[PDB]
């Protein structure tokens, strides 16, 4: 009876486990399966996807006991999709040693520490509460809860699978369940009809990978989606002129940019790395692509950080002529650079390169594209440019800058970057100091050695861009993922 929807995506996560799935691929689909104790209503008090209220979800309620612990009562009878009830065992093992922060924990859930604040041990009082807490002062931890990192996952089947194949197998408490997957291919889902929420709307939800984005365009045409994914401005016009199909875009608290192996021995230091962001003419890019509605950001720093934001901050400046000057002094001696992209993943990734080479050959230096299908994983050793998205994942200026650049975090260890010691001291010290002047100048302290440095060049939060038949009535939310809570409905 209900609708089987079918989206066509850009590409599946590497994994449905919550954690190791985090991507501009996985949250679409772990958003339904899984729920947290905390939810983000975006849709909150009309606003126009983007609300950042956070209300309870799997926690009936929950209050602050002291600077780094938080009690909460949990919502009772609510069930895994294996049928087990969700208990704060399940709660406390989700943030656990065991299976998220600890030294084993993060062999197979690689970030869990990364992107965790200081989690200490959670504290199981009785079947319905359970206090989580870090071993040091943290007012974001409400924050944490509410985000990508906080799915509630069931403790005994987890432990049964261990993280890689629960991550192909997933169970949660979501409106929707697994049914099955063909890796780089789909991922279908299944109404669960015993929901503790909002009764899930259509009967299946299918993730059909599309690599091409004329080609998931094409397929919408054609009838074969319902929505597609990771779409361009200027896509709109081969959508519109259909009067049952329709373009759906929002601004999205993500930052589209570029990398660099700093390893690699022409990137081990910064003189090139800022030279190439130096030549780069945003304003021109997304005029030219995005039709004036991707934004460039004024340094790593977005409105959504709340008391972080600093909007006096000024913008990174296109400086062809200081470029050249940092060319020369680098000593680069002409060496074609590639920068690897596979193919449009993110949104204009193609378009955008081709624009930036011909900047950079402005500044004298030889920049060659190198396209990579899906499924052919470039060795880390062969990168020397490559693109990349940070998902700004709190409302706090914390993530990303810390998350992914912080010490012992993957661009310092991974990718070679050798940072400052006072921008490690800096991203210490702001995990601990409470929304104020202090940590607002730390910030700014932070972003001018990230400007300095350059370990990646911020390009633009982009214009996310969905196409959908107008008898899927759907809107999109200003995240790198897809809400269908209160925001799915048929005819
Ligand atoms: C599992 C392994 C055993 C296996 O060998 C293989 O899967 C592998 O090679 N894994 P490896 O780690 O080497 O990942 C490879 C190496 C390379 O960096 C690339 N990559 C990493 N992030 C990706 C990205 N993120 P995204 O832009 O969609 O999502 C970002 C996310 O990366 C980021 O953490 C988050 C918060 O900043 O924001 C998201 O938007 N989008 C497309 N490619 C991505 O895949």
Known sequence: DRRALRIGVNGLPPSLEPINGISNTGPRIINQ?????????????????????????????????????????????????????????????????????????????????????????????????????????????????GSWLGPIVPKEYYKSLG????????????????????????VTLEANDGYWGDKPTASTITYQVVAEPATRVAGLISGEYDIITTLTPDDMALVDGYSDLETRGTLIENLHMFTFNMNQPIFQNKTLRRALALAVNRPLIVEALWKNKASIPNGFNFPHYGATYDPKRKPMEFNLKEAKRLVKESGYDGTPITYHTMGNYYANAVPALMMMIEMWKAAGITVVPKIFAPGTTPKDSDILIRNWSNGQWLTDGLTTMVSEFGPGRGVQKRWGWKAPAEFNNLCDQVAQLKDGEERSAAFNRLRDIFEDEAPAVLMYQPYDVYAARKDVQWSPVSFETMEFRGNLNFK
């Open 33 to 145: 399966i899984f729920d947290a104790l905390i939810r983000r209503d975006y849709f909150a008090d009309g606003a126009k996807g983007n609300n950042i209220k956070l209300v309870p979800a799997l926690a009936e309620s929950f209050e602050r006991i002291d600077d780094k612990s938080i009690r909460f009562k949990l919502r009772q009878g609510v069930k895994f999709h294996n049928g087990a009830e969700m208990t704060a065992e399940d709660v406390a093992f989700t943030f656990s040693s065991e299976r998220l922060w600890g030294d084993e924990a993060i062999k197979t859930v690689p970030n869990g520490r990364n992107f965790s604040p200081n989690w200490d041990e959670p504290v199981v009082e009785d079947k319905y509460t359970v206090v989580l807490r870090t071993k040091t002062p943290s007012y974001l931890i409400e924050k944490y809860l």
């Open 163 to 186: 993280a890689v194949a629960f991550g192909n197998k997933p169970i949660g408490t979501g409106p929707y369940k697994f049914r099955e997957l063909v890796a780089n291919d789909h």
